[PDB]
Nucleic acid binder design. Structure first.
Ligand SMILES: [Cl-]
Ligand SMILES: [Mg+2]
Ligand code: NA
Ligand code: NA
Length: 331
DNA sequence: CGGCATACG
DNA sequence: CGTA
DNA sequence: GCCG
């Protein structure tokens, strides 16, 4: 009754097993901090299965037969059901390693490998890093300067104001080009920690060279606090944008992506997420259908041909999957 | 046991 | 290495 | 950590 891949089942944004899923996602995150990608995936998948259930798990009996629940994930759920807390999860939560790796990897420009190296060098706090700035990249310096603002979520209200300023720059850069909101806000989130926009043009080829033109226009409007070509071909830009606030402003992470209209359904699918949904969809494609999926296309390696898609609905049909709207992709 | 998504900056 |  |  519960399929094994997250892309085979609807997963809504809010659900009936929030506490259980949050505990499993702590263990997934801790596995990632140790480089244990397989265990991270299992705990993420187990959490996602709970998100897809139609009602709360109340007894360990109800996990029998669910995919991705074995002895370890079942023991976590059993302790939460019996005692309201899981000793392993709480030990992770309070550990110095978990807390510091979480703080460091939240910095824009810092991943697990960098965070782990700093941890081993004895660093523990953001002010430790600020006192050692020669050990920081341009990107990391921006991430650290803006960390407080970037730690506070954006509202959907804020997103609509940002989309209008992006649309203005895009319209000057290339009349007729369009801007589509992707990411978590397209999945229905009311708030979130960055904003993602996908840009295209209805005439294939007209989007070539577009993103530099858009970024220079936003930069001239004074709206870009950081981007990687500020000193200046590219198709993805990971920026920090000035967002107006009552009497002031705040820094917000914004990603801009350009795709040709022939690739737009694939890019829309990929950039809408969730991350686990897309990993599961690509795994399903390759392992169950023998087709290779990415954010540009869907390749048949036996015929050496790419599928044409005019919509996300086309892509789900190609893969033999029931269509899921973005709000049911919250694996 | 092997496998675990797949790109771009 | 970072980013999504 | 779990699946096939
Ligand atoms: Cl692992
Ligand atoms: Mg996002
Ligand atoms: Na980071
Ligand atoms: Na093994």
């Amino acid at each position: 009754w519960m399929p094994a891949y997250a892309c085979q089942r609807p997963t809504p944004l809010t659900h009936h097993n929030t506490g259980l899923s949050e505990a499993l996602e702590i263990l997934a995150e801790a596995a990632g901090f140790e480089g244990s990608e397989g265990r991270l995936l299992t705990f993420c998948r187990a959490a996602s299965v709970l998100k897809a259930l139609p009602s709360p798990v109340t007894t360990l009996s109800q996990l029998q037969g669910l995919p991705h629940f074995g002895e370890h994930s079942s023991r976590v759920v059993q302790e939460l059901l019996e005692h309201g807390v899981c000793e392993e999860v709480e030990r992770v939560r309070r550990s110095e390693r978990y807390q510091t790796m979480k703080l460091f990897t939240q910095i824009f420009g810092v991943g697990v490998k960098t965070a782990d190296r700093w941890y081993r060098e004895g660093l523990r706090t953001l002010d430790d890093l600020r006192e050692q700035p020669q050990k920081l990249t341009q990107q990391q310096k921006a991430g650290l300067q803006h960390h407080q603002d970037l730690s506070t979520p954006v509202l959907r209200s804020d997103v609509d104001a940002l989309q209008q300023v992006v649309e203005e720059a895009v319209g000057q850069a290339l009349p007729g080009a369009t801007v589509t909101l992707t990411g978590g806000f397209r999945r229905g989130k009311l708030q979130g920690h960055d904003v993602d926009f996908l840009i295209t043009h209805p005439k294939e080829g007209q989007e070539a060279g577009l993103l530099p033109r858009v970024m220079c226009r936003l930069q001239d409007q004074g709206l870009i606090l950081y981007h990687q070509h500020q000193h200046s071909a590219f198709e993805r830009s990971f920026c920090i944008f000035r967002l107006p606030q009552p009497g002031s402003w705040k820094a917000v992470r914004v990603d801009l992506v350009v795709a040709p209209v022939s690739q737009f359904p694939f890019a829309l699918l990929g950039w809408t997420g969730s991350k686990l949904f897309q990993r599961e969809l690509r795994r399903f494609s390759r392992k169950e259908k023998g087709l290779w999926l990415n954010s540009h296309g869907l390749f048949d390696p036996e015929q050496k041909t790419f599928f044409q898609a005019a919509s996300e609905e086309d892509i789900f049909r190609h893969l033999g999957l029931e269509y899921l709207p973005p709000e049911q992709r919250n694996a």
